[PDB]
Amino acid sequence: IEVCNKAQQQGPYTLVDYQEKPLNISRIQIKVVKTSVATKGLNFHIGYRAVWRSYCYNGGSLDKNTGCYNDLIPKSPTESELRTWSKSQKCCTGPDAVDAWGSDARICWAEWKMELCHTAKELKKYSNNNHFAYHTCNLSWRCGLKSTHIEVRLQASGGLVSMVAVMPNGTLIPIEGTRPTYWTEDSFAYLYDPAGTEKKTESTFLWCFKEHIRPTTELSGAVYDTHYLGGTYDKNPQFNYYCRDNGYYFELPANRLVCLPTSCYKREGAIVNTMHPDTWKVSEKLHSASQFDVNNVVHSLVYETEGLRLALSQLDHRFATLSRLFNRLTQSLAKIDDRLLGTLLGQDVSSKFISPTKFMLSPCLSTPEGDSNCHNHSIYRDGRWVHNSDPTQCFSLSKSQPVDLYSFKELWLPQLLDVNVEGVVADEEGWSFVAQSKQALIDTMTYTKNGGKGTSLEDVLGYPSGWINGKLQGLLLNGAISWVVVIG
Amino acid sequence: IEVCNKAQQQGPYTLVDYQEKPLNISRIQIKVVKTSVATKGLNFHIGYRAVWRSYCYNGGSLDKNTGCYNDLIPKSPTESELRTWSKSQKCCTGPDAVDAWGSDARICWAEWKMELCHTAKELKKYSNNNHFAYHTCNLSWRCGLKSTHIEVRLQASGGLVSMVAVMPNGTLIPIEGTRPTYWTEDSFAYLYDPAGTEKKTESTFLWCFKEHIRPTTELSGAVYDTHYLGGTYDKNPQFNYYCRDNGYYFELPANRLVCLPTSCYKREGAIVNTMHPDTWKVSEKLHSASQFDVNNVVHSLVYETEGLRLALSQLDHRFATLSRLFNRLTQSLAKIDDRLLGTLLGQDVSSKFISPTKFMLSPCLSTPEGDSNCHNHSIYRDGRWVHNSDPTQCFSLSKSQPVDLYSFKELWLPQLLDVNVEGVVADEEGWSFVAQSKQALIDTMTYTKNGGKGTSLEDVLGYPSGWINGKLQGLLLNGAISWVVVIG
Amino acid sequence: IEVCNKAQQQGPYTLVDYQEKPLNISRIQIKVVKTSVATKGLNFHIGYRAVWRSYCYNGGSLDKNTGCYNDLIPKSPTESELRTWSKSQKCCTGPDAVDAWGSDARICWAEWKMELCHTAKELKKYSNNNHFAYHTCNLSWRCGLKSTHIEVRLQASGGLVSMVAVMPNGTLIPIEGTRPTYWTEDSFAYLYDPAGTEKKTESTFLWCFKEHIRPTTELSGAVYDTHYLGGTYDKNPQFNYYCRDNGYYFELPANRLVCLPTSCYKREGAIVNTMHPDTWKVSEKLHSASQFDVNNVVHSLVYETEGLRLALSQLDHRFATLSRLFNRLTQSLAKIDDRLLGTLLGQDVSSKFISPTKFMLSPCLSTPEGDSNCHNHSIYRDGRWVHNSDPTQCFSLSKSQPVDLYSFKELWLPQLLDVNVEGVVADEEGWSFVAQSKQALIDTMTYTKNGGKGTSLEDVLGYPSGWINGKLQGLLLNGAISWVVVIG
C-alpha cells in the first residue's frame, strides 16, 4: 500500500535552471562590437490597421431590395501615410459619422482612408436602418485590435544581416520583413510606433579559440598533409577563430555580420593572447625558423598540458552526474510508457514491469509508413492503434520539415484560443484528457457505482411501464369503481 | 483554462535522428579489410519444413474403433537432403495423394519425407472419411509457413568469429548456429535458400588512436612506473590501438577477427600517421637516444595542443546543450510520474506540484524485495501497490539477467500476436490502457451521465415490479371486470 | 492493432545501475586518512523517551467533579541522566504501579522521571476508575516507540566539521546536532545507545590533479597575466589540488576537514607523482632557471599528449551514446506529455502527434505567476488548468528553496503513512490516480455498460412509481374486490 498522505508537509522547492560554467581553457580574446535590439527593442518598425464599412439603403418590406454591406472588411494598405502617422502615433480614424444618403453618401461608402488620430478610439458597430426609400450608411471605422495583450505572437525581435546595417526584421509571416513584437500590431498598415526600440552597440571581447588551416592530399584512400609529404613549411598562414558567447558557440570571420539571433556581432580585431610571448611567436609562423628560445617554450607547454588535463577531469565528473540521472530516468518512466525500452534498443518490443527491478519484454513489432491515416484497419490519435467507432477523420499526412532538437531556430504563430489566468479552484487539469476529466471520472465511480447488482435488468430497452400503462390500469380501475357506477 | 484548439494548424514537423560528428583529433590510420553480410546477406544458410499426416480407417458406428491421426505434426529433420533442395530451391512436397487402404496404405502412413518441389504448394487439410471397414488416409503434406512476411524474428543477420572464416551464425534459438533472417524459415530442415547472401569484403582505414603499455609497480599503496623508479628506458615497446567506426569504438589487435556485430574487420597493418616525421620517431622508441631535432618537435607539440584545446571547447558546448534539455525534461515529466524526484535523489519520496515552478515532497518510503508477488498484502501490476479484488495471479519471480542500457546486444523472439496495418479511423490507441479505452470512457461520461439525481434508488436489488406483478394486478382487474362477469 | 499478448514470455531483465569508469589521466596522488561513520556508525549519540500520566479522582455522579488527566503527554527531558542510562542501555520505566489516593498520591501525579530499565516494557493505558470519593491514579509510564522499524527517517548518519573532531551530527530537525539513525529514537531524551557506532579511520591516496595560481590584471576590459606583462617569473608558487573519490570531485586544502557527506578526509601530504622526475621539476618552479634537460622533457610531453588525445576519444564515444538515447527519449515521451516540446524549445506550445514520426504544434501559450492559487478563474492540481466544482482549497503559495538537481544534499522527515509490504494480488497500483483506479474503471465500463439504449429515460427525477403508488392501486383493487364485498 503506502499511499503517503499529507500531515507534516515540507517547504516548497524549485528546480533552478541550468547555469553555464564554461571551462577556463581559453587564451585568446578578440575585439568585437555587440549590438542588441532584444531588450531596448520594444516593437516598432511599420504598422497595422483595421476598417469597418456599413453603407446601407433601407428599401423596406415592399421594395425588398436592400443589398448593403455592413461587414468587417479590414482594408489593409501599407507604408504610404506612415510618415504622417509618425507625427501623431495613434489610431487615425476617418469619418465616424454615419447615416449618409443620396448624392452626399460619400461618408460610409467613400475611400476607406485615415485622417484623424484618436487615443483609444473604437467601433460602435452601426447597424441601425431607419430611412425607408433612403440610405443609412453605418461606417464607424472600426479601431482597436492589438497584439495578444502580452508581447505579440508570430515572432520575437531580432536582427538580420544586411551587409552593414542590422535589420530589425526576422521575416516569418505578417509584417515588414515579417516580424511582430511587443504591442501595436497584428496585420499590415500603420499602427506600429516607437516604444523603446534602439540598438545598444556595446563592446565586448568574446573569449575564443583558433584553428589552423592545413591543406590535405587524398592519395590512395587516406588523408595526408600537403606540407608533410614534401617536407616544406607554409608561408603566410591563415587561421579560423571560434568564439563563445551566452549559450552560443559561433565562428567569427574576418569582416562580416555573423548573426544568429540578437547579438549580431561584427569584428574589429585586436587579438589579445595570454599564453606566452614566445608561444604566440611559434603558433603564428608554425614551421618557420623564427627566434624562439626552447627553454621557455618547453616550460609553457607543460603548464598548458596541466590545464588541459584538469579540464578533462571536470568534464568527466560532470558527465558522470549526467550518466546516472539518465539511467534512473529510464527506470521510472519505462513503467508508464510501454514502448520506451522498445525505442532505446532499436528494435520494437513492449515492456512489462512485474517487479520494481525486473521487467519483461513482449515483442509488439513494427508497421510501415507513408500512409494517409485512412486505409483498411488502423489509426493513431495519441500513440498507437486500437478500437474506435469510425468518424472518418483523414488528415492526408503531407510532407514535413526537420527541427534538429539540439540546435533550434523555430517559433511563431497563433491557432485559436483563450487565456489561463488566475484562480477559483474549479479549474484543475494536468497534461491531457486524463486530468482533463479527473473530477468527472471520480464522480462517475462514486455516484454511479460500479454496479454489481443495482442495475437490475434495466438495460433492456426503452419501455419501462411506458409510465401511463400503469396510468391506464389506474383509469380502468377507477371505473371498476364508480362500482360499476353504484350498481348501474 | 487555455485549451489551445485547432484553427491555424502549422506544417508537420519531424525530429531528425542524431547524426554523428566525430572530433578531428585522430592522427593515425590503419589498413583493414571490412566484411559485411548485413545488406547483401539476405537470409540463406540451411532450412525449414513442415509435415501433415492424416492416415485414417473409418470403423463406422457399429465398430466404433477409429483411432486415427489427422494431426498437425511437423516432422522436422535437418541437413540431410539439403544439397538436393539446393538444386531446386523450393518446397519439396511428398505424396499429396490420399485415401490409401489395406496393404498399399504406405502413402499417408509411410515415411514423411520430401521428394518433389513445387512453387507455392499448400495443404488441403484432408479429413474426409468415407470408407466403412476400410482406410481413408488424409495426408496432404502441409506446405507453407514462412517468416512473418517481413524479415524473420528471433534474430538478424550477423557474423561470428571462427578463427579465419566469418560465420553467418549468431546463435540464439532456432537454426544453424541459431539465426533466422529475411524470408524462408521458422524451424529446422530444408526451406532456406540463397536470396542475395554474400560478403562484400571492402577495404577501409578506420581512424584510430594508440595507447602505450608501461609496466607499473605496486609499492606501498600506490602505483609507480617500473621504468621511472629505476631510471631505465624501455627497449622494443608495444602499443595498443583503438579504432572508431560507425557508432562503434573498438580495440584492433595484431591479427584477429574482432567482430562485434556485422563488420568483423581483421587487420592488415600499414599505419599511416600524419603528425610529423619527427614526432613519429619520438613516440615509437619513447625514452631512447634517437636523432630527433628539438626545434621541430617543440613546434608540432604546440600545434597539437591547440587542436586538443579546440576539441575540448566543442565538447563543452555540446555538453551544455545536453545539460539544459535534461533539466527541462525533469520539470515537465515530474508532474506525471509521482516518484520521479524520489528516484533521482536516491531516497524514496513522492512529489506534488502545487505551482508550475514549486513542487512539494511527501515521503512515500521504500519496501523490501526478493518476494514472489504473493504474500499477505500488496502486488504490483503497473508501478505500485493499491487495491484490487484477488484473482490469485502469482508470477514466482525467477532470477534475471543484466542488460547494460548503454552497450546493448539483445534482440529476438516472438510471443503471439497480429499486425497494425493500415487505416479506417476506428482504431485509435496510445501507449497503455488509458488510451486503449479513451473512447469508451468518454462515451461513459457522456451517455451514462455522472448521475447526480437520475439514478433514483434504482441501486437497491433485482426486483423492480418483477414486471408481471403489475401484469397480475392487471389480470385480477380484468376479472373485477368482465363486472364480476356482468353481475354473475 | 497489434496488441502483443503473452504466450512465449522471455526471461526477466534488470537495468543495472551505472558503474563509474574514471579516465586514466591522473598522475599525482596524495596521502589522506579517510574516516567513516556510515556503515560502522549504526545509530548512537544521545536519546529518546516518552511519558504517560493517568492520575484521577472519581467524584461520581452526584459530585460530578472529576477533572483528571489520563493523557498521552510525552514529558521529554534531555541529557541529564543519560550517563546512567549508558550503564543499562534500555527503557528505564518509573512506577508502573497505579491507583494512588489521598496524601500518598505521589505515584501517578509525582515527578515523571526514570529509574528502572526494563527490556521490552510497554504501556497498559490504565483508565479504570473505581474509587468513589477517592483517587484512581492511572500512570503506566508509557514505553516503546522507536524508529520506523527500518532505519530512522528525518536523517542519515554523517560527520560534520568540528575543527579537529568529526561530529556524528548532521543537524536537521530532532536530536543532538539534530540527527536520527538506525533504531532507537524519535524525540529528545535517553533511549539511544551504541549498536556498532565507530570511526574506521582508513588510509587511502585519492587520485587527484593540480592547478596553478597565476595572478591576473584587469587592464582595459581584458584579463592579462601579472607575470607576462612585466616579463618576470614567480618565486615560491602555490598550487591547488582537486581530488576525486567515490562519485565525488572535491578540493583538498592544506590542513582542514573538507567533509561533504561521510568520508571527511583531512590531508597528511606525501605527493607521489608518476610523470617524470624532470617534469616534476619544471612544474614546481615554473619559469625558473632550474637544471632540466630538454631531451627528456620534450619526450615526456609527447607521451602525455597522446594520453590526453585518447581520453578525449573515449569521452566522445560515450557522449555519442548519450546524445542518441536522449533523442529517442523525446520521441516516445512527447506523445504522452503534451507540453514536452513546448518546454525544450523555450516557447510555450502544445504538440500533437498525427504520425509516428510527424507531430504538429498548437500554441498553448503562457500565464503569469506570483498568485495564491485562488483568484478569478484557474487552478492547478496536477499540471494545468481546466474545470472542477469549487471546493475552495487555497494553498497561499509561500516562498521556496533551490534544490540544484545536479549537486544534491537534501533528505529527511515523515508526513504520515503506512507500509507497502508483501502480497495478496488485490493490491495493484502504478504511479498516480490512473492506476490507483484501473480495476474500478474497467469494472465500470464492463458492468455498467456505455449505455447506448439501456438507461431508458430513468435519468429524470426521484419518483419511479414511488413504489407504493402501485401498492395503493393494489389496495383499491383488492376492495373492488372483496366484490364490493360480495354485493354489499
Swiss-Prot record, chains A, B, C:
A GO cellular-component term linked to this record: virion membrane
Stated name of the protein: Envelope glycoprotein
Taxon lineage: Viruses, Riboviria, Orthornavirae, Negarnaviricota, Polyploviricotina
Carbohydrate attachment residues: N24, N138, N169, N376
UniProt superkingdom: Viruses
Cell compartments where the protein resides: Virion membrane
Keyword S-adenosyl-L-methionine annotated: no
Function according to Swiss-Prot or TrEMBL: Attaches the virus to host cellular receptor and later induces fusion of virion with host membrane.
Gene Ontology BP terms: symbiont-mediated perturbation of host process
Quaternary data: Homooligomer; disulfide-linked (possibly homodimer).
Keywords: Disulfide bond, Glycoprotein, Membrane, Signal, Transmembrane, Transmembrane helix, Virion
Gene giving rise to this polypeptide: P4
